[PDB]
Ligand binder design. Structure first.
Ligand SMILES: OC[C@@H]1NC[C@H](O)[C@H]1O
Ligand SMILES: OC[C@@H]1NC[C@H](O)[C@H]1O
Ligand SMILES: [Ca+2]
Ligand SMILES: [Ca+2]
Ligand SMILES: [Zn+2]
Ligand SMILES: [Zn+2]
Lengths: 301, 302
């Protein structure tokens, strides 16, 4: 395939959807291709600043996202991750703020927002130094193990693992810290991907900059190994105001790179890098929980 | 944040930060937490007869304010205390010696009130052999799996007990396991244990008796339930002591607490900003140990 870029630059769409009546924001997207169409799950914020979740109706082209249905989940699955777990032929939805520190549900009908199984434990542990507690999971496998990565709004990235034959199931309560920095430099919204054909993994993490939210990147040769800084500063980031080509938003915030293969390896084609991110109008302000986040798409330049 | 521990320690120091109120001769064995952005310090007292009790200080924002903070006597003593917030059950804990059990604890939702604590409960009900004092100087620390009790015996040993985190608050029982052994003077008392922020590592400090005064030695571990390895191991190159403190008002660097920013049961220290609230005494002081004029000072890494 293609090696990761040494230096990142992008072009952007404008906003691709707006929240339906009774909602103020669409956040934290997770995307898969399902039956040749785009299947997107995400969080919601309502007029009171309370968080829930949803999916979009299946849509073929990004220009059609604005007319897709917005389907409210009856029990919330905030900051979701969706993937197909191939060894047991089942789709997985992982999330925070449910009955366990992280939870999951299963389905064979993932286009139905309300077709998921009863919640099961994904992780039951704790962290310290945090105003939020554990936040923003992702889940990724290799041929031997499944891995859980997450954040804490506290400058740390955490990891747990289990044998692949034990999944779906709980990772337990123990974790290991894999990265540490200032709170603003490693804040939240971590994502991890297999770089197709390159024997390498990509991690991206949301940071708080002087000029907006932006992403930093790291690389590894194994999911249980060391993470090395790649695009590390606000002025030369993975994706941010400095290199996004987006003028409708300053923020490039919590979302998902575009994955074509929907399986548990979270594989990206680095010949065709694209980023489904949350942004907000440059004129927006006030209460964080009421900010009008909505989706946009970056394509490498 | 996530700095590695230093390989080698050296410090600068304040002078005395506070002195005992009328009727007391010493303030000893501090335990500190941040409570709503302010410094909350508990400690032992020695009175004009050399008898031991406990107290807290009024809440204060800056170390320069400690000398004018109220000194609030506890109606029932909690000698050599440990204070922390037990997050899983949303409650503050005060652990201590010389009460109704070998080690005891009380609970509170109002920890700034010296006399607002619940009735005493058992923390530990065992004994140790070959000690002139019996069990002394507890601390309590958790990870994601278990809570741990560490303590000393004025006898060259450090002791450990443990329980599942879901069983706490409760008693650790009566059994203990010896994790370190040396001469009485090399591993004497005033043990403290901390999580090194971001490092997947733990730090233990222990008070020792040197030629030139009291000083601290250090150890590290990769798991709280595992083996402890010596780090700073001599009086001339200590964790903290006369050799490296930058303090001239005191020779002793004795029983206190590293500065913890997060108040919870993990006892986390930010190794980018190491500071030590220690007990010291005037260089011209002397005589009976129980009457010594111990009082607080603060080290900052140099
Ligand atoms: O949108 C809900 C939370 N907001 C910050 C974090 O990235 C999300 O989990
Ligand atoms: O200050 C009371 C005791 N004195 C020695 C020991 O470190 C303390 O528990
Ligand atoms: Ca996410
Ligand atoms: Ca102590
Ligand atoms: Zn930190
Ligand atoms: Zn003040």
């Amino acid at each position: 395939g293609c090696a990761l870029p040494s230096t990142y630059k992008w072009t952007s769409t404008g906003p691709l959807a707006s929240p339906k009546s009774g909602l103020v924001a669409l956040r934290d997207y997770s995307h898969v291709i399902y039956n040749g169409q785009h299947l997107v799950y995400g969080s919601t914020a309502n007029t009171a600043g309370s968080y829930g979740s949803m999916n979009f109706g299946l849509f073929s082209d990004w220009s059609e996202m604005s007319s897709a249905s917005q389907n409210t989940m009856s029990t919330g699955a905030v900051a979701p991750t969706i993937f197909y777990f191939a060894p047991k032929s089942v789709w997985i939805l992982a999330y925070q703020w449910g009955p366990y520190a992280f939870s999951y549900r299963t389905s064979t009908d993932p286009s139905n927002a309300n077709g998921w199984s009863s919640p099961q434990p994904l992780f039951t542990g704790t962290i310290s130094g945090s105003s939020t507690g554990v936040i923003d999971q992702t889940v990724i496998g290799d041929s031997e193990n499944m891995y859980l990565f997450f954040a804490g709004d506290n400058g740390h990235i955490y990891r747990a693992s289990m044998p692949i034959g034990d999944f779906p199931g709980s990772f337990g309560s123990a974790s290991t810290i894999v990265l540490s920095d200032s709170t603003n430099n490693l804040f939240e919204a971590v994502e991890v991907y297999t770089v197709e054909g390159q024997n390498q993994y990509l991690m991206i993490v949301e940071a708080i900059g002087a000029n907006g939210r932006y992403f930093r990147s790291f690389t590894a040769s194994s999911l249980g190994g060391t993470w090395t800084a790649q695009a590390s500063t606000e002025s030369n980031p993975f994706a941010g105001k400095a290199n996004s080509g987006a003028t409708w938003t300053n923020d490039i915030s919590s979302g998902d790179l575009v994955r074509t293969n929907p399986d548990q390896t979270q594989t990206i084609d680095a010949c065709n890098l694209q980023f489904l991110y949350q942004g907000r109008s440059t004129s927006s302000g006030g209460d964080y929980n009421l900010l009008p986040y909505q989706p946009g798409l970056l394509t490498l330049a």
